[PDB]
Amino acid sequence: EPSDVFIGLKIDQITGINQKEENFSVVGSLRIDWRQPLLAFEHAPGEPKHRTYTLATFLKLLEEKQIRWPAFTYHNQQGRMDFQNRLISLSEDGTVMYLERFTSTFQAPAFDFRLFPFDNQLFFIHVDSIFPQHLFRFQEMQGFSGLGDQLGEEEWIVTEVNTHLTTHNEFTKGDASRFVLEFHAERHLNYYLMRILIPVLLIITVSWFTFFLQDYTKRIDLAGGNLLLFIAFNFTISSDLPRLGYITLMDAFLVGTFIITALVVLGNVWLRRLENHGKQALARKLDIYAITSYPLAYLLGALTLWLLFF
Template sequence: MRQAVCGARGRSYGLGVWVCWLLLVLSAAPVRAAALDGELELQRDLLYRLDGLRAGQSVTLTLQASGGSLDPWIGVLRPEVDTAALLHDYLPEVERLRVHSRDRPEAFARLAERFFLASNDDAGDGGYGARLRFTAPADGDYRLLVASTPLRPSVGGFRLEAMAEGAAPQLSFLQPVGVGSERVQSLDARLDPAHALRLYELQRINRGETLSVRLEADGDWLPQLTLYDFGDKPLASVSATGKGQALVLHHTFGARDDNPRLRIRAQPVDGRVAAGAYHLSLGINAAEVEQGRVSARGPAVLREPLAVSIGLKLHQITGVDQRAENYGIVASLMLDWSDPALAFNPQECDCRQRVFVGDSFAQYVASLHARWPEFIFANQQGNRWSQRRVVVLQPDGHATYFERASLTLQAPDFDFRRFPFDQQKFFVRIEALWPEWLYHFTELPGFTEVGGALGEEEWVLTHHTSAIDSVSDSTGLPVSRYNFGFVAERHLNYYISRIFLPILIIIIVSWVTFFLRDYGKRVDVAGGNLLLFIAFSFTISGDLPRLGYLTLMDILLISTFVVTGLMLVLSVYLRRQEADGHLARIQRIDRLVLAFYPLAYLLAMAGVMLIDY
């Protein structure tokens, strides 16, 4: 009506139309807004309420991410859908669709129509924020479900804003959905005397929530329980004063703590540290935990160690230094893990993934006040020369680390007692820098292998292995270790042609001299043969490892030297016997040497070969 009047007046009077339209604007119902901030976690949706809407009243809801990797979703519940229906009908069906129909957004849309008056995932403005406008079908209160998009996992902070004509909408938080207020977890573990300390990181605990802990120790050791906040300030502690005593600890948090920790330590008894097995029960808002063993329910109270898949490809052996007992390799290393703390919103970079080169990933993680599974090569000597280091990070926090590097590694497992018929074990040992309750290594399927052209001519690889174990670091804490090992043996052609064949010739020459009847010439040949062997020993000395024990090759050379020297002594003796006219004795000795010398030498060498060097 007023529009028609203003239109008529506008056509009749030039200035009056502006006054008329100004009156319309001033008399129109004002648009008022209410806003709340919140944060979504994995497996935890949030329920809000809009109070006192009138039939026909339009409300615009806007949900924008304010941190983390959150891709938000919002829906207005139908009045007949209660919280039980959400828990038992809607949320299980969402999980089923995520498993079987993740790439079919229309399936999620059909499901939402059954439970919601209106819902929205993306506002359509090129971003991932959610926005919807709905009109209340009747007077009353309406409930809103705030969640992560069902198409992929995401977490983070958000801002929820409701705008309506007339009176400002009353927006209030109701409750979390999908995670009950009570959580209970229990586990069995043990402390070793070498690792008499264990730290557990807890999930976020909100203001007003109470943590209850009960520890039952088996054996004669005395445990101590201490709870720390995010800054490692002790919040509560309890110690056992007698054997078999159950420890109970509880603490109500006055503020939200994103990273509390629980420490279990074995107390010294009579000057020594004894440890053993224990049963640990933890509960959030579950006081019955303090009374005894209870069944687990709800999400975990503890942060589980992140599994880091690790594998190594050996491309090249650049050299083996037998004297220094080390070897050089060129290898590729890959780590694969998922950490929600590293998740990001792809809208921030307009990208499907982030790629970091060199040290930029470590700097990025530091900027988030987070951590990543840093590592060291435990048997590395000198520097590690990285040809390429790349980290690919997905929006959900899934990260893949790749590095190709050349480095020198210590090989204390070398054993040269059977040199050159020895088999040597080579190891690459990679240790995590963080304790194993934060990260633990697992095998990366299909990655670990040995290349076909290693470039090492002296050695031939027979087989390789990989294994995961736990060791103590320099602080005494247990860390996860990845062991890649391979076994190699030598190509013998070089040693046969350059060492064994000349030794055989020297031995034969020593034997052949006994066919000479000129004992003076025999002395000359034996002496020359000994000098030849000495020169030969100096020639090959650079090819032999310098060790604190004798190798098979050392024994062979020493034996040859002794035999060659004895042959010279025997030749001098026979020459003297000839001068004294004892020809019959000389002939008997010659016959014995010609008959038994080769056999005796072969038997001696066979005995040396059979010795377990």
């Protein structure tokens, strides 16, 4: 007959989410309730009903009594887990109450940058029983598992928190318990506005003003610089993210400005060429297209992407 293990997990802090390395880091507390009849003991009346053990001696106790503990791993843990507290409280009955406080990093392979920066992502911690269900089944320790109030994370904000149970088959042939803490969060886009969109629009608009000079050479020299600017903005954003083998929304928007700004150069080159072959008057007539093409192309291009991605 297999004994129930009551798995509770609360994330107190999100220390940060490194989206480039596709992981996040949390301060968190794991809580386990587990009745083991064999661990139960007798007290004299007036001697305490509850024994408080360091994890160190509590396991050395279990080893001595040849009792199996419900050994568990965090499947998506990365690197070290700095433990704060690992503390056991045992009762007359042989109910074990375990607390594990830790800061640690976790894999989140559920990262989809397709709609970056307008994206919503799945973050989750997996807690697996090493031992199969035929020995230990995990049950939800109700009234504990979730996320806290002061997470300290300013970019992401969390949509929903859910806890669910399931199997794995990592070390066993047999089905084995896995407690899961999931959360979805999505980005506060202020940064992306204030530092990327606003500037790129400011560059584009203030550039368009200088079309009313009707120096075609100046427009060419301007758009040529704009190109390098965007090629930089392309490097800014490229670093935020991993070396993805797919094309971001952001990725597309940049190549947008590329294509346009490439043509702005080519077009004004041709207008300027007419001026150079005694057809200045034509250019100046023709020119009106070029002045109104500029802004339409960027706003035709705005709907082009917005439909392709939404």
